[model samples]
Each structure stands twice: as structure tokens, then as C-alpha cells.
Target: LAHSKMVPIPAGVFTMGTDDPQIKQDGEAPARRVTIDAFYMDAYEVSNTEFEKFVNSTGYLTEAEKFGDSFVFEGMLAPWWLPVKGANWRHPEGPDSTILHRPDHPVLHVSWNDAVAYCTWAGKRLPTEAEWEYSCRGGLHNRLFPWGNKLQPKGQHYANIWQGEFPVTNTGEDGFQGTAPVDAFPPNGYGLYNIVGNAWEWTSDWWTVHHSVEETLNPKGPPSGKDRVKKGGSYMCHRSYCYRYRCAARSQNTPDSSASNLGFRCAADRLPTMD
Candidate 1:
């Protein structure tokens, strides 16, 4: 359906986790080699404009809409975030705010379920945890950020992450206080945009504390779990707190949980071509 917007990631094997001393989380431990098959992935996160079409056609009400509220970053407001009513993908902040000015921005307040629904309609599915990280690396191995080892090469801001003091104040040094346009940053080696920062993209795998020691071929995570995996830390990430913007970083949330900083992209198997 939306084939034109997808990027073809070549099949290959790459190191999948981090042993960096700086990383405090155990979820990204025992860096191991993993193999993944070639697949098509959305170059950009699903934007509000694109999602609006899904809503219009399917009449699917998001979890936030059904619950009548979603979590917003406290830093986005004066007194921190609260359960805001009427805050769906359309109204990110609340009933008072709308996506009128941010149509091209990545859609927010979407849970894993919402993302899966959208993918189903789009004839795609969420990338597995291994596939998501492998694609995010863009063929680069054992690197920190998607671009390279450095967070900001040549002192230039590559992704839309927190620049200044996080939470209390954001200097908008990267030219954004909250979310930027889906294509705001330079594409990675695979011509994928905003694979690291912007927003946390949901993965198909369930959350696990540590990866398997044996080499994993197309790992889809554990058999069952409560929280699904979330990768590519959001705009609120900072070195002082959540320094999870690296290629190997990982996090998770309940499938039905929705937040302003959480959004996702879609992926699908490569179509067969007869020669």
C-alpha cells in the first residue's frame, strides 16, 4: 500500500547489544551477534498527516481516545504532565492542543496496539527487536549512535534529542523543544531518517532483561511478556537521565500504554519478484 515510502534493508549479520561501561541498564547486556533477513521498513515514523488517513478510512479509535487521556511530558507543560482528556493522536497535549501546525510531525499518544493496527491496515507489521536494532545501526557495527560512535559529530546535532538541561529546561539547541518533522535529520547509511532520537519506535518483540548468549537468527524475543519493546529513545532523552538514544539501547511498556513520546514505524517482508 505505502510501498513507495519504504527502504529496503539488506540481509546481514551484526552485533546486537552493548557492553559499554556507561550504560547502566542490564537489558542491553552480553552484546551478541545476530542475523536478520532483508526487509522493507518505513523510512520515517508515522506522521500525524499519514495517521489521519488511517483514522479516516478505518474509523479506528486509538487507545488514548478510548481511555480519554494519555501521558504528556511534564517538561512540555508548566506543572508537569497529568492525565489529559481528549488527548489522542489528533490532540497531543489535550483538547486545547491540536496537530494543525504539526501535521508532518510524528504522531504521538499511540500504543503498541495502535501501531499494530495501523501496520495491519498498511499491509505491514512491526519490526522485531533484532530487526529494529539491525536496521537502526544501518550496517554500522558496535557504534553508539546511529550515525557513528559520537553523539554529535563535528559538533553538529544529528538527531532531535534534548540539548540543554532536560526536564527543567530545553534550550532547543537541536532546533526543537519537543518533536521535529519526521525527516528533520540526515538519513542513516540505509537512507532511514530519525532512527535514533525523535520518538521511541515500537518493536514486535516482548521485553527481556538480557539477550541470549548463543548467536540468534532472527530472534523474536521471549514467548510471552507483559511489556513490549521500545527502541530509539525519544526527544526527552538526555545523558544525565535517559541516555538510551544509542543503536543498542532498549526499553519497554505495556502494549496498551500510550505516551506523548512513544510512536512507531512499520515493516514488512520483502515481496517476491519473478524474473
Candidate 2:
């Protein structure tokens, strides 16, 4: 996947979620007012092409490679197969894997550490949960989706997600089977792309579930946890099962864990806003 060119989002407040009957995840409910300062975010998730550049420059191997083993999807495995060793970002499926034709696909099998390292090398950082959600909502106050409440209003594609039977058959009606290029779709109102599906993004928040009801301005997550929060569920997410692809949907994973459906984008703070 190619990196998205920068698009500036002006500072503003957007009603972050919905308490409507339609939207599921009540954790994202009690929809409240949230303000975000101006910042620069990638228009889309980092792509294989971009990641390769970093690897070449830094020569830093991902944790999976350092460990020499990583989990593979059971559905994609043979009955007699064992957990594959050396299944890192370069070899997403395993050692024999190659991204020859997938240069435009988002780089997967990246852990939070790996993501942070990449961001640091690039002079950027992962967005906080607040920043990620605020950018995702795209000034579409209280809307179920960045584009609108309707999933596919008038049969239009908003983001890449499972259309038909998931984990088995993909309808590809959304113009993707796996990961699409960074700029494959139209940017949201804030000029951000792939904030819904395509891939799940890592945030700076430590994982915690409903730790407290007290809301804060530009709140981060709990101070510490075993795993960090991830926003924007991936294509593997399905409404029948994991409907976490919604704007407010969130999930957590161990910092060392990496999955084929996981990727990240970079964030930069506004200097004047901090002052």
C-alpha cells in the first residue's frame, strides 16, 4: 500500500458517537462532545512500499522475526500443519510468502512496538484513541459512519469490508478482497482515508474496558494495561460476528502480537496547539 499524501484537517469539534437505536456498541454511546486540535495524519494506512523503505533504511526486523514464530490463521492452514516459524512482516503468511504483486497492500504482521519504532524513525507517532476517533468521525456529527448512517446508501462503497460470507467467500463488492491501496477510496470530510475498514490501526491508549465513566477533554485511555487499544476494525470483521469496524468500535491486543489484518498510520502534533 502506498502512503497517502498529507491533508490538513482544521481544528473543530464533532459529536463523537451516537446514542441512536441503530448504532450498536453502547461503549461508543452517551455520545458526547469532543474537541480535536489541528494535526497532520496520513490520508491512509502505511503500505508495503512505504514499510519496505523503512526496513531498508533502519534494518530493524520485527518482533515476530526475532522470536522466529508467529501465529497463522487456522482456516488458512492444513490439518497437519504446525505453527509456522519466521512468519514476520516480510513473510506475512510464512517464510515462503512473497508480496511481489502486493506492493500496494498494507504491511501486516506488525506489533505496536514495530509500529512505534517505524513512527519514531519517521519522526511521527501513533495517534491517541481520541485523535483517531475524532479524525475518523470526520466532522460528521453523530453519524453512524464517517460518510453517513447508511451502510451502503444507494449502493455506494465507503470503505473496504466483508460484503458476503466472511472468512470463506468475499463478495469483493467493495472493490477489495484483501487490502486495497491507500488512496483506493475517497477521503472523508476531514480528508482522511481508510478510517473504517481496510485495516485496524494501533492507537497510543493502553487497553481498558469501561474503566471510568468520567469524560475528559481529549482523553487518552487508562495509564496502563496488558494490551493497547486498536481502532477501525479490519476487513476480517463482520457484522454477524465482530462488528467492530464501526467508527467507535475498539479492540485491544498484546503489544507483541501481530496479525495479517493489523496495520497503522502516523500522527504529528500541532506545535501551536500544544502551547
Candidate 3:
């Protein structure tokens, strides 16, 4: 958010979403043409070190901490787990858990409101739906990811995602069952990293069931909704189910809810206008 470094995405048009069979989310179907203006985005998801700066300065507690509880995958919990309270970004696994050996990894279990708070405090804002997609695509039109369509083309690791069984056994073949450091992978053409599967990032757009084919320019999503849009699936994603990590994939969650797989990135508007 502080523009530690910025990659400039030139204004352009790209096919948003797709009709591909690999695209599992129905909301991602009915591919449409979308145009977006140039913008600046974090090269990686918000890292623990960066988030710690926000916490240290503002003493801010994420929604998960305020609620004293948040959802945890039942399988990930210990056999005698008590659904520990105070589970949040700092205590990712639980109150007793810490980000030891993984302080550079992206912070998880953050809600939309929490993400917005960080952006606001940092003098930035969440990326709009179009801006997010353009950055995720990395100027590659119709490709399935920021780099290209291959999940693991030529047996190269592109991002952190589920490798073995999901919600059960994770072989960590992707070099991570949970998360890798934000800079674990090579940057995309746009000089961005982890745009696919590190974590589902919150966006400025509101969730909507439909999109008009009016060829609108720089749309800001729906006016209102019960949930906010989220893009780029997380490590929980698998080919068997929840393949939302594709470039065009999308989903939504309530504003104040936090999950182990959700995190965010920040954006600054282009000078003059975002058109």
C-alpha cells in the first residue's frame, strides 16, 4: 500500500471470464469483454511483515480476533481441538500458533473489512473488479493464469496451490500445503507474484449474479449486495473441486467474515482518472 515498489499496468482490454470447461465456477462463465485503466498493485499479497507494521502502528485487531473465533477446516484442527478462540492473522493456526519460519508468507484469515482497513490506513484502496482481472491476467489474453494457461506447464511451479488431496491430504508438491513466502514464485509479466493461488484476495466490487453485455467501460461492479467479490483461489483449491484459481474465476463472501484461505492486495488509482 505504501508503494514499496509499483508495476505499471497499461490500460487495455481483455476477455474477462471464459467459457472453458476448466472454469468450474458458474459465475465465471459467459465470458465477456472488459476494459480497464492502468493501475498499481502490490507485487505480492500482503505479507506478515507488512501486516505487522499495520498492527504495530494502529493496534488494530482483525475481524477474526474481534469475533474471538472464525471458521477452521475441521480436518485441519487437532483431534481434540476445542476450536480455539483468538484465531486470526497473528495466530493463524490458533492462539498458541505463530508465523514462525513463515513471517514472509502472505497473511491469511483476514476479512474484507480488515483488508479495507489496512488499505485505508496505508493510503490505498482495494482494486476494482476490472483492475484486479487485468493485473491477474498479466496482459495475457484468454490465458488461465497471470503467466499462461498451463497450471504446471513443463513441470514448472508457478504458484502455491493444493497438490495432493484437498481438505485431507496435501502432498505439498507445490512446495506448500498452506502457504509459501509471498515471493516464492517468479513474477508475472506485469511483475506481480502469487496472483493465482496464494489466497483469495478481496476486491472493491460487490457480488452480483449477472453482468450486462453493454460493453461498459471501467465498471465498478454492482451497486449493492450481501457479499463482496473475491478473486484468485487459495491453497485449498484443487482440480477435483473448487478450481477457482483460474484467471477468470471468482467468488464472494460476507464483508465481516474471515476464513483461513482469504487475504488481500491493495491498489492506488491512476492519476487523472481510472478510465
Candidate 4:
């Protein structure tokens, strides 16, 4: 069976959110200890090829396809998030775009619902926000990035974030102007790749900011909300515009919302029956 690596994360307790003072309303303050169950996690973001098999096996049409369009952001000055007639997971940029040429690239234009469907078909589920942060930490603690606490390292660009100007120009200094291969960079300590960049991943939890407790186990966020949580940063992420390319960073979107810079991977409660 076609597959990606699923690293096993042992059940343990760790800090979930961040105590650092940030500018975004990420609600990452007052870091607290939380226990997460042991689970298997994909080492790479779900690639176009991986999602292709899921669609072929199930003949599933993504929400973008049903709507006949999805949003695109090509550095347009105004209303750049405008809908493109044929922008779906298969045609990431637009209808004219072909994913066959970029099979190894992380699948984009996937809504949270679509991501859930894919994971369900694979007998898996999206990782909880706490699981995401814990696995992303790579056994480190209180680090800003999966690699280290600062400056994105001296030489290697660990993630495929915007290397140059954002929303205007991407110098492609990180070897990619848009999405790079799923394994473009080295894996983290936990063998997870692109944990903080290339694309924003959909989490299982709904978006929320008003819930809290001293200690909890397996937090699933609010039981209900308008949008779902999307973690990590994306290729469009730039420190100047949006400084969210960190371990504890987060954002959200409606379940049916699809974009060119959004995608997801899967996590399993236990070992898979098959890949």
C-alpha cells in the first residue's frame, strides 16, 4: 500500500500553550501542563500523491470541487483571496494548474472537512492542537521553533516559509517560491517534517479562546465553534507580516473554507490496520 511514515508518540505530559507575549490574538499565553495520549503521527504533510490515492480509492470530490472554485492569494493588492474557477486540491493554483507535476508537494486547497474525510478513509484522525504542539516540539521545551528557540538557525532554512518579501515577492531563497516537497527540510527530533511551515495543517479541535483549566488530559478545545484550528505557518508566512511560524502559534478557518496555502496530515489512535 502507498504510505507515509507514522512516528509513534509516547503518552506523556508537557506544556501545551506558550507563555511568551505575542502580537497575534493566538491565545498562546499562560502555558499550562497537559497530558496527551500516545498516538501515531505522519512524519510528513499529506502530499498531493498521498491525497491522490485517497481520492482515487474513494472517488471523493473535495468541497472546493463541489463549489467549483476556491480562494487564491497571488500577492494581489486587494481582494487577493478571490475565488478562482477551478482551484481545488487537484488544481491548487487554479483550473489550469496541474498537480501531477508536483506530486510530492503538500496537497493544498483542502478544507478541514475534506481533511477529516481523508483521515477517516485512512482510519486515522487529525491531531489535537496539544498533540500537534507536543509532537512539533520534538522533545524540546519552551522553544519558539521545532529546530531551536530563535533565528531559524544560522544556515539551514528548516521550514519553507517566505524567504524574502511577503505578499509582494518571495525570493525563493529557501529553494521554493510556493510549496516545496513534503520532505523538503530535515525532520524534527521526533522524525516529523515540515511541522511549522510549507502549509498550515488542520487540527481536530474547533477554534476557541475562552476555555481554560489548571490541568487537563487530551484537550479537544471547545466542543463547538465557528472555525477549526489550523496550526503551523505557511509559505506566505513572513516575520514582517505574520510572525506565526512558531511551535505554539495557531490560526483558524471555517470547516468548508479552502485556500491555496492550507492542507493537513493525519494521526491515529493506534497502529494502522494497513497503510
Best by TM-score: 4
Tens-digit per-residue lDDT, 233-267, candidate 4? 98888889888788788888899999998999999
lDDT of 4: 0.86
TM-score, model 3 to reference: 0.91
- The all-Cα superposition gives candidate 4 an RMSD in Å to the true structure of 1.8
Where does candidate 4 stray beyond 4 Å? 1-3, 76-78
- lDDT, model 2: 0.76
- Best-matching candidate per lDDT: 1
The TM-score values for the models, in the order shown, are 0.94, 0.88, 0.91, 0.95
The residue-level lDDT of candidate 1 at 257 comes to 89
- The candidate with the higher TM-score, 1 or 3, is 1
The candidates, ranked best first by lDDT, are 1, 4, 3, 2
Instruction: Pick the winner on TM-score between candidates 2 and 3.
Output: 3
lDDT of candidate 2 over 1-275, digit per residue (tens) = 23645556668776655555233433565566666778888777888888888899999899888888776654344332245787767777788887778887788888999999987777778888878888888877666677888888788888887778756677778888767877777788988888989878999889765534344566776887898988898776678766777777777889998877789988876321210
Q: What is residue 4's positional error in candidate 2, in angstroms? A: 5.0
Q: Give the clashing residue pairs of candidate 1, or none.
A: none
- Residues 1-275, candidate 3: write the lDDT tens digits: 33234568888888887767465444676678887877778778888888888899999988888889876655455332234577788877777778877788888888999999988877778898778988999878888878887888788988888877666788888788787778778888998888889878999999985866557578899898899999988877887977888778888889998877788888886432211
The per-residue C-alpha lDDT of model 3 at residue 110 equals 89
* Steric overlap count per candidate: 0, 4, 0, 0
C-alpha root-mean-square deviation, candidate 3: 3.7
Candidate 2, 2: how far from true, in Å? 7.0
